[PDB]
Each structure stands twice: as C-alpha cells, then as structure tokens.
Amino acid sequence: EDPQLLVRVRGGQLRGIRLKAPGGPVSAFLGIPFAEPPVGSRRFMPPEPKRPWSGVLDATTFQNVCYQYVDTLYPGFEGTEMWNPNRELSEDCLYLNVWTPYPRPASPTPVLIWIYGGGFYSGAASLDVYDGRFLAQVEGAVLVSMNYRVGTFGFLALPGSREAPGNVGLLDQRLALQWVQENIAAFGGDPMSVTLFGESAGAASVGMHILSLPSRSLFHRAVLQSGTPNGPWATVSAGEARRRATLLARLVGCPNDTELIACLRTRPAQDLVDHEWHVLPQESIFRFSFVPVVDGDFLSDTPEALINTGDFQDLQVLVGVVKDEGSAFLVYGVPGFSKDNESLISRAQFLAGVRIGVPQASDLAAEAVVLHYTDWLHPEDPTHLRDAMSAVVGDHNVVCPVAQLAGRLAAQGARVYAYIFEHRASTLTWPLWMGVPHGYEIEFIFGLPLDPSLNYTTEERIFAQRLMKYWTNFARTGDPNDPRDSKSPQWPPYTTAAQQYVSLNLKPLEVRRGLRAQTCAFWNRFLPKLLSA
Amino acid sequence: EGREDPQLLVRVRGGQLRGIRLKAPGGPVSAFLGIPFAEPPVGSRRFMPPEPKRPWSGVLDATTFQNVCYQYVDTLYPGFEGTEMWNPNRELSEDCLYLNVWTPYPRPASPTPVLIWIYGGGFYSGAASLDVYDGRFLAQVEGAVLVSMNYRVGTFGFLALPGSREAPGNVGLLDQRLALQWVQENIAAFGGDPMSVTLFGESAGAASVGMHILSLPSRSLFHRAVLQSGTPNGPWATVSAGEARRRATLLARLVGCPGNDTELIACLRTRPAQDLVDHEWHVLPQESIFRFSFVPVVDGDFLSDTPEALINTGDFQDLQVLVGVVKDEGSAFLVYGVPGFSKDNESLISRAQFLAGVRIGVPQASDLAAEAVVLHYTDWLHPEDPTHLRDAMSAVVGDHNVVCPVAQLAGRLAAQGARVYAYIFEHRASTLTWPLWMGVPHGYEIEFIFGLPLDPSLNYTTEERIFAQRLMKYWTNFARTGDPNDPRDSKSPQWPPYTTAAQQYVSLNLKPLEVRRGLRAQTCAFWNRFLPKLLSA
Ligand SMILES: Nc1ccc2c(c1)c(-c1ccccc1)[n+](CCCCCCc1cn(CCNc3c4c(nc5ccccc35)CCCC4)nn1)c1cc(N)ccc21
Numbered sequence A: 001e002d003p004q005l006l007v008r009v010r011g012g013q014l015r016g017i018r019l020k021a022p023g024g025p026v027s028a029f030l031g032i033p034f035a036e037p038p039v040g041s042r043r044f045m046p047p048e049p050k051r052p053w054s055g056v057l058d059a060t061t062f063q064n065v066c067y068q069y070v071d072t073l074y075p076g077f078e079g080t081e082m083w084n085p086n087r088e089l090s091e092d093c094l095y096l097n098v099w100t101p102y103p104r105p106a107s108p109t110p111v112l113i114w115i116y117g118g119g120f121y122s123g124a125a126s127l128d129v130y131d132g133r134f135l136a137q138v139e140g141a142v143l144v145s146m147n148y149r150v151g152t153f154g155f156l157a158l159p160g161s162r163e164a165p166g167n168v169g170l171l172d173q174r175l176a177l178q179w180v181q182e183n184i185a186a187f188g189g190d191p192m193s194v195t196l197f198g199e200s201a202g203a204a205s206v207g208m209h210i211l212s213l214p215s216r217s218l219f220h221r222a223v224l225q226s227g228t229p230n231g232p233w234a235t236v237s238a239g240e241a242r243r244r245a246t247l248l249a250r251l252v253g254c255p256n257d258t259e260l261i262a263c264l265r266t267r268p269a270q271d272l273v274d275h276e277w278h279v280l281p282q283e284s285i286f287r288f289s290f291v292p293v294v295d296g297d298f299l300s301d302t303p304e305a306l307i308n309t310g311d312f313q314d315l316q317v318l319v320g321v322v323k324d325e326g327s328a329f330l331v332y333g334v335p336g337f338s339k340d341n342e343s344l345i346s347r348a349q350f351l352a353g354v355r356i357g358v359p360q361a362s363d364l365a366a367e368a369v370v371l372h373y374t375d376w377l378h379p380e381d382p383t384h385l386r387d388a389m390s391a392v393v394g395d396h397n398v399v400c401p402v403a404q405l406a407g408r409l410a411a412q413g414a415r416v417y418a419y420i421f422e423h424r425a426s427t428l429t430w431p432l433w434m435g436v437p438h439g440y441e442i443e444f445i446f447g448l449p450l451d452p453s454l455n456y457t458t459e460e461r462i463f464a465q466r467l468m469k470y471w472t473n474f475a476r477t478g479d480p481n482d483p484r485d486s487k488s489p490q491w492p493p494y495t496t497a498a499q500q501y502v503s504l505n506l507k508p509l510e511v512r513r514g515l516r517a518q519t520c521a522f523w524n525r526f527l528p529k530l531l532s533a
Numbered sequence B: 001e002g003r004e005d006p007q008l009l010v011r012v013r014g015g016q017l018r019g020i021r022l023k024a025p026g027g028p029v030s031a032f033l034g035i036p037f038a039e040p041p042v043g044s045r046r047f048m049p050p051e052p053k054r055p056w057s058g059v060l061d062a063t064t065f066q067n068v069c070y071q072y073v074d075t076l077y078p079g080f081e082g083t084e085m086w087n088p089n090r091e092l093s094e095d096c097l098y099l100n101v102w103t104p105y106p107r108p109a110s111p112t113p114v115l116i117w118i119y120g121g122g123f124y125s126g127a128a129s130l131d132v133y134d135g136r137f138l139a140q141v142e143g144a145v146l147v148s149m150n151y152r153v154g155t156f157g158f159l160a161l162p163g164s165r166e167a168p169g170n171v172g173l174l175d176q177r178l179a180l181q182w183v184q185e186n187i188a189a190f191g192g193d194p195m196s197v198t199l200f201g202e203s204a205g206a207a208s209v210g211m212h213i214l215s216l217p218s219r220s221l222f223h224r225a226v227l228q229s230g231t232p233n234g235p236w237a238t239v240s241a242g243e244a245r246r247r248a249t250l251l252a253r254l255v256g257c258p259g260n261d262t263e264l265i266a267c268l269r270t271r272p273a274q275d276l277v278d279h280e281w282h283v284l285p286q287e288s289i290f291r292f293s294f295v296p297v298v299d300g301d302f303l304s305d306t307p308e309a310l311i312n313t314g315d316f317q318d319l320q321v322l323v324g325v326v327k328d329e330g331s332a333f334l335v336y337g338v339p340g341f342s343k344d345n346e347s348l349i350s351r352a353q354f355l356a357g358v359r360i361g362v363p364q365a366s367d368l369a370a371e372a373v374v375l376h377y378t379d380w381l382h383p384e385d386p387t388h389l390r391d392a393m394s395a396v397v398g399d400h401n402v403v404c405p406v407a408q409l410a411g412r413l414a415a416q417g418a419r420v421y422a423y424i425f426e427h428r429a430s431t432l433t434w435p436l437w438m439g440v441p442h443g444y445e446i447e448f449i450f451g452l453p454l455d456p457s458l459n460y461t462t463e464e465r466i467f468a469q470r471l472m473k474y475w476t477n478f479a480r481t482g483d484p485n486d487p488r489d490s491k492s493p494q495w496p497p498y499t500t501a502a503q504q505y506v507s508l509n510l511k512p513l514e515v516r517r518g519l520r521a522q523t524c525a526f527w528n529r530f531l532p533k534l535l536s537a
C-alpha cells in the first residue's frame, strides 16, 4: 500500500492511483464524493454535503457523468464524440477529481479548479481533454475538477419555490469549492491560492462565482475562456425560467409549485432530457433551455447590472476567445451548413441564418446585422457569407460579451489579461472552414500535446508548454508573465484606454489593440437601444 | 460696323453681338459675355418662369460679364480669398439672366463639341462670371466651345407655392433650361455643335445637371453630363411640395405678407430684393449645415416624382455620365454652424462637440439615428481623440450630403444602362487658403478642371500645370466621345467604367491614374440602405 496514495479528508480515508505522465508519475484521486447523491426527493434541490464514510474509499476511478443529452448529429465522429459522456450516465454524479505531483507537494501549492462547459446541458470532468495529469506533472500544480448537475437536473427552476429554487448546478460547483477549502491542504494544495478556470458555460460559471458574494471567499483568481456570465445565453430571468419549467412539466404529463415539482420528481431521467429542447421560445443556435436564473439570491441582479456596479479591485482575471467562436454552432440548425462540405451559402440563407443566430432580433435589428456584416464589394460571395454567419454567431455570443466583461472589470479596478487563441490543432477533425472552433484551445492548456502517442507536431508541444506556463504563472501570481524571462514581449494588462490583448499562436506573443472594438460597439452599445424601440 | 475685328461679330436669334479677343497663355480666344437669353425676370415677373429674350436692334455689346443674380454675400471672413472667390464679382440685380460663350480664335472652321457649365452655391448663390469658371483655357487649349449661364437663386429662383400660377417653383431650373434651348438654336453661329452638348456642374450645379437628366423636356437639349460633387437625390437638393409651401409661407410672414396664393405672391412682389435675402435663412426647420432654404421642389411637373424614385425606375441606356467627389466634401461646411470649428485654429473638438455636431450635420435624424451615426463614426480605440472627432465630423457631413448620394447616382445609373465614370479628386491646391485640416474641400477641383493653373501669373506648381492639362483632357475627351480615355494614348493607364459588379473608380491626383474599388462601399451602405429604414421605424 503506497503511503503517497493514502489521504485523510474530513469525511474519511481515500485511496488514489499513481498515473503515468510522459515526464514522471502523478497522484490521482478520482471520483471523490462531495455531496449526497441528488436523487429521488433531492432532485432539483440544493446539494447537501457528503456524509462521512468508513474504511478507505476507492478513489482510483472516474465516477458517473451527470445525466445529460448525448450528441447524435454525427455518430462515431471524433469532433463530437470527444465531448460526449465517457462514463455511465446517472443522477448520482456529485464527484470531484484531484491530481497532484508524485510525491505529494513538499510545501503548499497553488490550486487550479477546472469547471467544464457544455451549454449548461452537458459536460463531464472525466473527458480526455480535461486530463489534469500534465499540469500536475510539468508545473507541479494541484488540479481539481468537479462534476455538477446540468440541464433540467442542474437548472430547472420554479423561482421563489422551496423545492426547485434554481441554480442548483452552480451550488454543486460552490460545494466543490468549499470541499477544496476544507480538504485540499491534505493533498498539498494551498487553499489560500485557488484559481477557477473554465470554458464556455464553465467560463460563465466562473463569472457567476465572481458575481456571487458567498462564492467569493472560495477563490482568488479566475480564468474565463470563451464565455461570460453576461451575454445572451448564460442566464434567464425568473419569468422565463418559470415559463420553461412550466412548459416542460406540461410536455411530460405534470400535473401550485409543490404539486408540479413532485410530479417532475417521479419522472425517469431520460423523459426530462427527451423534451428538453422543446421549451426554447424560438428556433435558434447557441441557446440552451436550462441555464442559470436571475433569482435575486445566487445572482442578486443581472450579470450586466452586477458588472456595471461591482467593486473588483481585489480581483485578477484572465479572459479570452478562440479565432472562430461561432463556426461549429452553425451545423446545429442553420440551413446550408455541414461539416462534410464547404458550406458555401446564398444571401437568402444568410439573412435566414441571422434570425436563428440572433433569435431575439426584430426585423430592423436583423437587417442592421446583415448590413453591418455584408461585404459590399462582393455582397453575393458565398465564402464571405459563410465566414460572416460564423462571425455573427461568435461575436454575438462570445467575443463581444468577453470584450464587455474585460470591460468593465478593468474599469472597476480588476487586473485583466486578454487573449485570442489562433492556433488550429493539426489533429482537428472538423473541416478547415471552421477555423479554430469553440472549445479547441482546451487540449493545449491542459497539455495534451505532451503525450507523444497523440502525435501533435513538435511545434504544438512547445506551444502547449508555453500555454501551461501562462495559466499556471497566472495561478501562482495573478500575472501570466514568466517572472524570470527577461527576453520579451510582455503580456500587458487589458485596460479600457489601450484595450491591449495578445494572440496565442505558434509565433511569439503579439500585442494587439481593441478586441473587435468597432464590431462590439454595435453589439454592446447599439443593438440594445435598437431592440428597446 | 467696319473698323473693328471682323472675327468678333456674330448674329444670334435675338440680333447682332460684338464680343472680345481675350488673351490666354497659349494664344487668343473669342468671348461673348453678357448675352441676354431671357426677358429680365423683374417686377411682375418675380418668381415667374422665364420668358425668351425679345430681339434687339443694333449691335449688342458682349464684351463684359453682366449682373449677378440677387443673393446672400458671404461675410464670415472679410478679405479672405477662400470665401471672396465665391462672392459676386459684378453687381447684384434681379435682371441677371445672361450667358457667356468662349470659343477659339478665330472661331473653329468645323462644328465643335460644346461644354455647358452650371455653377453651384447651394441654389442661393453663384455666378457664371467668377474667376474659377473662366472658359478661356478650355477654349484655347482644348478648342472647346464653353457656355455658362446665370440662373436665379434663393427665393427668386426657388420660392414656391406649389400648384399656384404665380410661383410654380423651380424657375431657376427653367432659367437653365432656357439657356440650353438658346444653345440649341444659336451655338452653331459660334461654330459649336448643338448635337454634341455636355452639361457639367459642381455642387448645386451638379444637382441641376442631374435634374436635367431626370426631366424629359431637358433630355433633348444635351447629350452627356458630368456631376461634380453633387446629385439630384440626397438630403439637400430638393424639398417636398409641402415643405416648400411651408417655407414660402413662413418667409412671406417674416417680411410682413399675410388668404389664397395670389395675394401672398403679389405682396412678396412688392418686397425689396434685399429684404428677401435678409430673411432667407430663417425658414430652415432645424439648426443645420448643408441645408438651403429654397431649392428645387418636387412639383410633379419639372420633377415628376422624387429624384430617388426617378433614378430607381428611369431607363438610362442612352446616357453617359462622369461623376465624382473630392477627398474632403464636408470639412469647409463645419465652420458655418458647428460649434468648435473655425478656419483659424486646428478645430480639435470634444466628444460632446461631436454629438452636438452630428445633430446639426444630420438635422433630420431622430435620437436613434444620431446614435447610429456616432457609433459608426467613433473610433472605439480612441473615442475621445479630438483629431479623429474633428475628421469624423467632416466625414459625417461629407458622406451624408455628397459622397453617398453620388455613390448611388453611380450605382443606379449603372444598374440601368448608363455608361458611368467615377473619380475621387485628391489633390490639394498649393495655393489654397483654407487651413490644412480641411484637406481638399468642396469646390476645390474646379480651378483645375478649368485650367487656371495654366495662367503663369497664378503661382501654381509646374506639376499642377501638367495635372490641370490632364484633367482638361479627361473632361473634354468625355465631352467629345463619352469616354475620358485618350483613344490614341496606348501607354497612360485606363479609366474603366463604374459597374455594380466591380465598383471601379479612379483617384485624380499628381500621380498617374490608380484604379480603386468601391466608393466607400461599407459606409455608404449605412447612409443609403440602413439610415432610411431606421428613420421610418
Ligand atoms: N431533433 C432534435 C431533438 C432534440 C435535440 C436536438 C435535435 C439537438 C440538435 C441536434 C442537431 C442539430 C440541431 C439540434 N440538440 C443539440 C443542440 C446543442 C448544440 C450545441 C453543440 C455545440 C457545438 N459547440 C462548438 C464546438 N465544440 C463543442 C461541441 C460540443 N460540446 C462542447 C463543449 C464545450 C466546448 C466545446 C464544445 C458538443 C457538440 C459538438 C461540439 N458547442 N456546443 C439537443 C440538445 C438538448 N439539450 C436536448 C435535445 C436536443
């Protein structure tokens, strides 16, 4: 029995497993319960802390993935399957995983806590792209990820009710955060040095933790990759959630809130997932049925209100986007798009595609979008029309909300660093026209190209190393710059005056100004005034 | 008759004229200045359509420019060449309907292509006698017959009670048409070809050329057209019948005229010319720049529908147009109403002065539209930078009034069978007295088209002299053939037609012709396609 793989946490003894990383061994503790399984009468309810256990809990293995929709658009295809559950689905899924160096760190080590994306309807901390072994081995980081409930199970809300208050998936994350505070020292983590990081919905989740006071004493720094609490998709109003929850009930035979919720709780999990999409108010892409709600509790006002009025002086934030935020979403509903062909679209297809990417837009607002995104020298050119449709979706959903947050945090005293990620993986299975799609930086940050068997290029393995350094340096210090590297160029902070950001690609850091400033002026300043009237 | 130059005696429908041998650098030219083409539109004829000049006995002396039509005289900068050069340089009179003819000397043995100039000045000012409109150079160097007319401006030209007998509107355009009919009947006496007549004009002159293109009775009087920095469509060149009624009535009220149209017009008639000029500007509905009180009216007669509708549905297969703009259409308008702007300092404005400037530059915008304008013109990297704000103000005014209205004239005419040629003029005169920040202001290419730099005593650079010769060649090549390109000249780069598919136009500067694509395509899609729709809802 290996003494390095035996840990005593607050609720009992754990046994981890030594994993092999290319440069040496790592200690992994997989599938640690941090909450009472949210099953039966606990469905839709806030999580409760996990009861103590006897003897030694087996923590050598990933545990169930929270019950969620499984993608079937391209069955067998790697570009989609890599996001699909890789363990058994179950409502019994409140488990976290910890990777540490081997042997366990000698002194307290910065902790990085990963929160997965998946539109708040999917994701798992067990996916191959979130593998913590590389960051633990190379940078000596303690890396943590938690499963948290998604779709109806994490976010179905009848706001104001006791038994479905909304946001329980965010409370799952928060409980994992407290678990880290209480237990990470046992693993050689420094609970005084926790950095959240996340992508897509995970990034929005990180942002929500920023904007919720009870979460604020559970971390120091945050990294938001391709997502934000503000923006069109990450939240819904109380009114809208009540509507969706009510409508879902109606669609599954149910039936006051109590009666309604009790009958929802009698329903098989797959019955809820079956009808999950039918509650969206409009035909759309980049919209999700069950997402955090503005409840006046976890979130005391809209993310927009909270970012305009917050005090962020104590905060360090790393934010960024990938080069092609919207391209991969187009094949999930926009007529004319497929991964299997070059998706050259007509102008008609372009206006039509816009009403789906900007579901809330009036005829005028949509016209405004089309006019601002048309290339007036070749208005009919099908490659630009395709690329523009992709940029409409990316800008509206990710880039401009990010610019807005970077914002914003900078204006209210936060230290902010921003990037755009422009390297396309040589191993990528989506077609070339999609460029560098939403989600495709993650493998680089986690250090997957260091696994010689995945055959990334040599250049990409160097690049992954640089990225792991920025992230862990940032975790360590709140500054992504290498504090011993006296040869340039430096990653400067994002400020509202200079709006400086960096491109992460194969070439050395390039400093740029304005994160599509002109385009985001439209989306953040003009579009809202236009929908108003 | 017989002691004077036998080569300066010509007869026209109205009688005998004596003109004058003028000196140009290359040699002599014949000029016939001050030829009456209409009965003086004075007295009971104020606001009425012009009546054809009645024949005279004896030899009319045609050796000097004649009266300028009654108009506002600029005073913002006394003694300053930049404003004075546009001010009247003969006496102000309602009796002002005269035209001018420059021909080679001796007059051409064979019928020569005719160029007809129509001056600009917002429809409230202008004169065919200004130094910058001097025909001698085109006449001498290009062998051109150049004709230019006075037409009535301000109230006298454009004050209208639409539907009435006594003030039908558009009479200043009718003055211009009467001069065109005069060229048809008489220009052969000077050795001009009435079957080869080109109109050309800048600013309001260009809009006038455009109205002639759009008005059927005018279409038989000329044969191509050149519009410099002006269009008949756009926010300033016309007014609805309703709005013209409103302005006439308000001005009537401001000069103490009180209720049908006959009394009202009779009382206006009545008023001293100077009193009308004194109150002209007071009828504008909002605080504004690039708006003028009395302009062509959509009467359902001269203009059968709005210019916008006429260019969308007209057939233009037989038409050849040269159109274009200068680099800085709006800059010189800013000193005439936008707080913060002056000719005597750098005009570095604040962000507040910009939002305030937009409401004046786009007087018709709701709050929403003005916000769109600001958003589209702010540089979001440096949103408070006073140089950019200054230059954006200029661009807003220039884009909205000239560049983008030109941009469709070109597009619509080309979509509908015209042969169109397009230019942006980018050379700043070395002699210019406006400040540097104003760049190449509205009106400042005319000088070069007319060949003024060929006058050695004017202090233009040698390259400017070559430059003017080129432009003159382009313009007269176009008059001559409908094609600015030199047929003979294999070497020199070619000026392609403007098409909807390729949107080609040329830079006119000291460098050889460079072909560019899309005339502010991205920005003009805002003003011509989006702004209107925003202004509805
Ligand atoms: N006929 C039906 C019935 C039910 C559902 C349907 C369709 C669909 C659907 C399938 C194909 C086309 C349109 C719609 N859907 C799917 C719509 C979801 C579309 C989002 C897919 C997407 C695409 N991307 C960008 C590229 N990278 C990723 C992904 C995926 N996940 C992630 C997660 C994190 C980061 C990146 C990433 C998953 C899919 C592929 C690419 N992110 N997310 C359902 C979903 C439900 N929750 C419930 C029911 C149904």
Ligand SMILES: Nc1ccc2c(c1)c(-c1ccccc1)[n+](CCCCCCc1cn(CCNc3c4c(nc5ccccc35)CCCC4)nn1)c1cc(N)ccc21
Binding pocket: B072, B074, B076, B082, B083, B086, B120, B121, B122, B124, B154, B202, B203, B277, B278, B280, B281, B332, B333, B335, B336, B337, B441, B442, B443, B444
């Ligand atoms: N207090 C008063 C009283 C009466 C009038 C006043 C002001 C003004 C005014 C003057 C200064 C500032 C604001 C308003 N105005 C306004 C006149 C100013 C508007 C036009 C100025 C302008 C500026 N540009 C651009 C530069 N190039 C030119 C010009 C001018 N003319 C031309 C004509 C053709 C081509 C070019 C060109 C004239 C002046 C300066 C430059 N063109 N025109 C009046 C007008 C009237 N018809 C009657 C009365 C009054």
